[PDB]
Write an enzyme that holds these catalytic residues in place. Structure first.
Site, PDB file in Angstrom:
ATOM      1  N   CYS A  30       5.520   0.677   1.108  1.00  0.00           N
ATOM      2  CA  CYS A  30       4.477   1.049   1.933  1.00  0.00           C
ATOM      3  C   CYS A  30       4.799   0.159   3.173  1.00  0.00           C
ATOM      4  CB  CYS A  30       2.893   0.660   1.306  1.00  0.00           C
ATOM      5  SG  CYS A  30       1.702   0.409   2.620  1.00  0.00           S
ATOM      6  N   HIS A 106       5.822   9.408  -3.402  1.00  0.00           N
ATOM      7  CA  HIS A 106       5.818  11.001  -3.328  1.00  0.00           C
ATOM      8  C   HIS A 106       7.174  11.241  -2.332  1.00  0.00           C
ATOM      9  CE1 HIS A 106       4.316  10.571   0.716  1.00  0.00           C
ATOM     10  NE2 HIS A 106       3.342  10.083   0.683  1.00  0.00           N
ATOM     11  N   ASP A 107       7.387  12.390  -2.442  1.00  0.00           N
ATOM     12  CA  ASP A 107       8.785  13.025  -1.769  1.00  0.00           C
ATOM     13  C   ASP A 107       8.194  13.404  -0.336  1.00  0.00           C
ATOM     14  OD1 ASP A 107      10.125  13.178  -4.221  1.00  0.00           O
ATOM     15  OD2 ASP A 107       9.680  15.085  -4.747  1.00  0.00           O
ATOM     16  N   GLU A 184      -1.915   9.085   4.767  1.00  0.00           N
ATOM     17  CA  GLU A 184      -0.968   8.499   5.336  1.00  0.00           C
ATOM     18  C   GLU A 184      -0.710   8.970   6.835  1.00  0.00           C
ATOM     19  OE1 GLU A 184       2.061   8.633   2.283  1.00  0.00           O
ATOM     20  OE2 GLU A 184       0.924   7.280   1.058  1.00  0.00           O
TER      21      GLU A 184
HETATM   22  C1  HEM Z   1      -4.129  -1.063  -1.385  1.00  0.00           C
HETATM   23  C2  HEM Z   1      -3.689  -0.251  -0.235  1.00  0.00           C
HETATM   24  C3  HEM Z   1      -2.418   0.481  -0.173  1.00  0.00           C
HETATM   25  C4  HEM Z   1      -1.716   0.846  -1.054  1.00  0.00           C
HETATM   26  C5  HEM Z   1      -1.688   0.563  -2.532  1.00  0.00           C
HETATM   27  C6  HEM Z   1      -0.837   1.611  -0.411  1.00  0.00           C
HETATM   28  C7  HEM Z   1       0.443   2.422  -1.218  1.00  0.00           C
HETATM   29  C8  HEM Z   1       1.528   3.235  -0.534  1.00  0.00           C
HETATM   30  C9  HEM Z   1       2.508   3.744  -1.169  1.00  0.00           C
HETATM   31  C10 HEM Z   1       2.764   3.790  -2.796  1.00  0.00           C
HETATM   32  C11 HEM Z   1       3.100   4.536  -0.317  1.00  0.00           C
HETATM   33  C12 HEM Z   1       4.538   5.372  -0.574  1.00  0.00           C
HETATM   34  C13 HEM Z   1       4.154   6.910  -0.547  1.00  0.00           C
HETATM   35  C14 HEM Z   1       5.323   7.355   0.017  1.00  0.00           C
HETATM   36  O1  HEM Z   1       5.711   7.409   1.423  1.00  0.00           O
HETATM   37  O2  HEM Z   1       6.438   7.996  -0.943  1.00  0.00           O
HETATM   38  C15 HEM Z   1       2.536   4.298   1.024  1.00  0.00           C
HETATM   39  C16 HEM Z   1       2.886   4.671   1.987  1.00  0.00           C
HETATM   40  C17 HEM Z   1       2.611   4.603   3.276  1.00  0.00           C
HETATM   41  N1  HEM Z   1       1.386   3.634   3.619  1.00  0.00           N
HETATM   42 FE1  HEM Z   1       0.519   2.589   2.278  1.00  0.00          FE
HETATM   43  N2  HEM Z   1      -0.872   1.739   0.626  1.00  0.00           N
HETATM   44  C18 HEM Z   1      -2.082   1.199   0.900  1.00  0.00           C
HETATM   45  C19 HEM Z   1      -2.558   1.070   2.230  1.00  0.00           C
HETATM   46  C20 HEM Z   1      -1.987   1.273   3.634  1.00  0.00           C
HETATM   47  C21 HEM Z   1      -2.750   1.409   4.672  1.00  0.00           C
HETATM   48  C22 HEM Z   1      -4.251   0.723   5.077  1.00  0.00           C
HETATM   49  C23 HEM Z   1      -2.070   1.806   5.916  1.00  0.00           C
HETATM   50  C24 HEM Z   1      -2.234   1.946   7.361  1.00  0.00           C
HETATM   51  C25 HEM Z   1      -3.620   1.942   7.944  1.00  0.00           C
HETATM   52  C26 HEM Z   1      -0.876   2.184   5.134  1.00  0.00           C
HETATM   53  C27 HEM Z   1       0.164   2.980   5.542  1.00  0.00           C
HETATM   54  C28 HEM Z   1       1.063   3.809   4.850  1.00  0.00           C
HETATM   55  C29 HEM Z   1       1.997   4.816   5.441  1.00  0.00           C
HETATM   56  C30 HEM Z   1       1.963   4.982   7.104  1.00  0.00           C
HETATM   57  C31 HEM Z   1       2.982   5.351   4.549  1.00  0.00           C
HETATM   58  C32 HEM Z   1       3.845   6.494   4.600  1.00  0.00           C
HETATM   59  C33 HEM Z   1       5.412   5.823   4.862  1.00  0.00           C
HETATM   60  C34 HEM Z   1       6.187   6.758   4.876  1.00  0.00           C
HETATM   61  O3  HEM Z   1       5.995   8.094   4.766  1.00  0.00           O
HETATM   62  O4  HEM Z   1       7.569   6.451   5.193  1.00  0.00           O
HETATM   63  N3  HEM Z   1      -0.994   2.033   3.742  1.00  0.00           N
HETATM   64  N4  HEM Z   1       1.510   3.340   0.732  1.00  0.00           N
HETATM   65 MN   LIG Z   2       8.324   8.538  -0.840  1.00  0.00          MN
END
Ligand code: HEM
Ligand SMILES: [Mn+2]
Ligand SMILES: *[C@@H]1O[C@H](CO)[C@@H](O[C@@H]2O[C@H](CO)[C@@H](O[C@@H]3O[C@H](CO)[C@@H](O)[C@H](O)[C@@H]3O)[C@H](O)[C@H]2NC(C)=O)[C@H](O)[C@H]1NC(C)=O
Ligand SMILES: *[C@@H]1O[C@H](CO)[C@@H](O[C@@H]2O[C@H](CO)[C@@H](O)[C@H](O)[C@H]2NC(C)=O)[C@H](O)[C@H]1NC(C)=O
Ligand SMILES: *[C@H]1O[C@H](CO)[C@@H](O)[C@H](O)[C@@H]1O[C@H]1O[C@H](CO)[C@@H](O)[C@H](O)[C@@H]1O
Ligand SMILES: *[C@@H]1O[C@H](CO)[C@@H](O)[C@H](O)[C@H]1NC(C)=O
Ligand SMILES: *[C@H]1O[C@H](CO)[C@@H](O)[C@H](O)[C@@H]1O
Ligand SMILES: *[C@H]1O[C@H](CO)[C@@H](O)[C@H](O)[C@@H]1O
Ligand SMILES: *[C@H]1O[C@H](CO)[C@@H](O)[C@H](O)[C@@H]1O
Ligand SMILES: *[C@H]1O[C@H](CO)[C@@H](O)[C@H](O)[C@@H]1O
Ligand SMILES: *[C@H]1O[C@H](CO)[C@@H](O)[C@H](O)[C@@H]1O
Ligand SMILES: *[C@H]1O[C@H](CO)[C@@H](O)[C@H](O)[C@@H]1O
Ligand SMILES: *[C@H]1O[C@H](CO)[C@@H](O)[C@H](O)[C@@H]1O
Ligand SMILES: *[C@H]1O[C@H](CO)[C@@H](O)[C@H](O)[C@@H]1O
Ligand SMILES: *[C@H]1O[C@H](CO)[C@@H](O)[C@H](O)[C@@H]1O
Ligand SMILES: [Br-]
Ligand SMILES: [Br-]
Ligand SMILES: [Br-]
Length: 299
Positions: A30, A106-107, A184
């Site tokens: 993330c 995820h994928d 996301e």
């Molecule tokens: C406890 C809070 C959070 C957890 C546990 C978490 C966890 C994760 C995980 C496991 C992924 C990987 C999913 C994947 O792309 O295969 C991810 C991706 C992502 N996260 Fe977080 N997330 C949290 C909060 C946030 C917040 C608040 C934002 C922005 C406001 C954010 C932005 C993103 C984005 C944009 C991705 C996609 C990255 C990509 O596809 O390359 N996340 N998150």
């Molecule tokens: Mn992924």
């Protein structure tokens, strides 16, 4: 940034500098968690992280309200128990375990490769966790030559990523994940849509330079005029954006999309894993950090 710099003022009155992760530090798949950890808003080592630590870090330093991360916290802890084999209580063991595939990770990510992307043998796996410049470029290329993009553009981006992943992943691996991905998608609109435009709340447009800075540097684009959203973004904004992305008309259709790719997505829900199911091995790569250029404390 350095507390005395006043770079976050008056949106964040208590900043801490960027510090690159070291080889033993734990980082996430993330870009948000990684930025927070790089600033020590959650532990710089990426270990032993409570729910309140995460809540405060998002709220005070990124303008993301508690409601936005409610499901994400639930699922982080579900994945922690699944990977480690015991309840994690209120101390998330580390960030790295969140890259457990076909789970929360995820994928068809915007900026990460898939766990079995381009592998010659079925048992092989790769780094599905660290920022991957090439993968991210496949996302940016969909909006090449632009400074901003809208919901329909984001829909085209995620479709491009789904098509590429479905084509490149080891046969049988690819699994579509519209509900988690598009939360996301809404997160991207919530963090880096252009709040300087009069109709931002109703019709948000992502600033591409802000998005690129956040993802590439895993730090905050203050130097580009970004600041934490004020008031803090709430879950309503995120899921509305998610729905709007998937509702947006598709004007360019990639080949090799999985079944039902185009159209509404299910609501994201709590994950669950069978006790008989052993977790997939985590990629062991050292944490990524920006090196072209390396970042200073105020970057
Ligand atoms: C406890 C809070 C959070 C957890 C546990 C978490 C966890 C994760 C995980 C496991 C992924 C990987 C999913 C994947 O792309 O295969 C991810 C991706 C992502 N996260 Fe977080 N997330 C949290 C909060 C946030 C917040 C608040 C934002 C922005 C406001 C954010 C932005 C993103 C984005 C944009 C991705 C996609 C990255 C990509 O596809 O390359 N996340 N998150
Ligand atoms: Mn992924
Ligand atoms: C973040 O935490 C996770 C979860 O604890 C760490 O992944 C796990 O790391 C341990 C080593 O501490 C691995 O255990 C080893 O497993 C092999 C084969 O099962 C066994 O032969 C060894 O004796 C040892 O028990 C475990 O496999 C691994 N879990 C998974 C699902 O990959 C991870 O290393 C931590 N990352 C950071 C940067 O702190
Ligand atoms: C990652 O952060 C660095 C440091 O803030 C950015 O480098 C700056 O880029 C801007 C142009 O947008 C220049 O005005 C500065 O002179 C640069 N500083 C250095 C040290 O090169 C970099 O652009 C960021 N990366 C992305 C992709 O946004
Ligand atoms: C992660 O580390 C494992 C050993 O701890 C390796 O067996 C895996 O292949 C994987 O290696 C990759 O990441 C490590 C960082 O620990 C590098 O040292 C390797 O060069 C490799 O990129
Ligand atoms: C930062 O401090 C200024 C001056 O006291 C204040 O007006 C502002 O509300 C503070 N910002 C936050 C987010 O508390
Ligand atoms: C984002 O949120 C919307 C509304 O809940 C879903 O339809 C979508 O699939 C994604 O999870
Ligand atoms: C996004 O979607 C959720 C349901 O998934 C709603 O609760 C919210 O109001 C927004 O429309
Ligand atoms: C839900 O909220 C989003 C973000 O404010 C809007 O863009 C959408 O049209 C719906 O009202
Ligand atoms: C989810 O919400 C979005 C934004 O309100 C709609 O555009 C979509 O049709 C779905 O109801
Ligand atoms: C949604 O609308 C677009 C035009 O904006 C069409 O190209 C598409 O086929 C879908 O009907
Ligand atoms: C339809 O419009 C999308 C963006 O909304 C483009 O990416 C596509 O090439 C076509 O012009
Ligand atoms: C590309 O093609 C698909 C299906 O062929 C449409 O759903 C989409 O609107 C675009 O025209
Ligand atoms: C329209 O855009 C889609 C998604 O980015 C491409 O797959 C297609 O080739 C066309 O350029
Ligand atoms: C990252 O580290 C490099 C050392 O190669 C410095 O040159 C740069 O200023 C930044 O601190
Ligand atoms: Br650990
Ligand atoms: Br590949
Ligand atoms: Br779905």
């Amino acid at each position: 940034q350095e507390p005395g710099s006043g770079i976050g003022y008056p949106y964040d009155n208590n900043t801490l500098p960027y510090v690159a992760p070291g080889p033993t530090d734990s980082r996430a798949p993330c870009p948000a968690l990684n930025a927070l950890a790089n600033h020590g808003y959650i532990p710089h080592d990426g270990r032993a992280i409570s729910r309140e630590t995460l809540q405060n870090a998002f709220l005070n330093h990124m303008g993301i309200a508690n409601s936005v991360i409610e499901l994400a916290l639930t699922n982080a802890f579900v994945v922690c128990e699944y990977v480690t084999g015991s309840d994690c209580g209120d101390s998330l063991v580390n960030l790295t375990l969140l890259a457990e595939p076909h789970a929360f990770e995820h994928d068809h990510s915007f900026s990460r490769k898939d766990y079995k992307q381009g592998v010659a043998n079925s048992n092989d796996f790769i780094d599905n966790r660290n920022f991957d410049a090439e993968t991210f470029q496949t996302s940016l290329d969909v909006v090449a030559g632009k400074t901003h993009f809208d919901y329909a553009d984001m829909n085209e981006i995620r479709l491009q990523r789904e098509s590429l992943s479905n084509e490149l992943d080891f046969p049988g691996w690819f699994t579509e994940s519209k509900p988690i991905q598009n939360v996301e998608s809404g997160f991207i609109f919530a963090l880096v849509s252009d709040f300087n435009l009069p109709d931002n709340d109703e019709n948000p447009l992502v600033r591409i330079d802000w998005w690129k800075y956040w993802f590439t540097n895993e730090s905050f684009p203050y130097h580009l005029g970004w600041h934490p959203p004020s008031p803090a973004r709430e879950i309503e904004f995120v899921t509305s954006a998610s729905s709007a992305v998937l509702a947006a008309s598709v004007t360019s259709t990639p080949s090799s999309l999985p079944s039902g790719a185009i159209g509404p997505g299910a609501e994201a829900v709590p994950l669950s894993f069978a006790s008989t199911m052993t977790p997939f091995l985590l990629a062991t790569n050292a944490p990524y950090y920006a090196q072209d250029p390396t970042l200073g404390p105020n970057d």
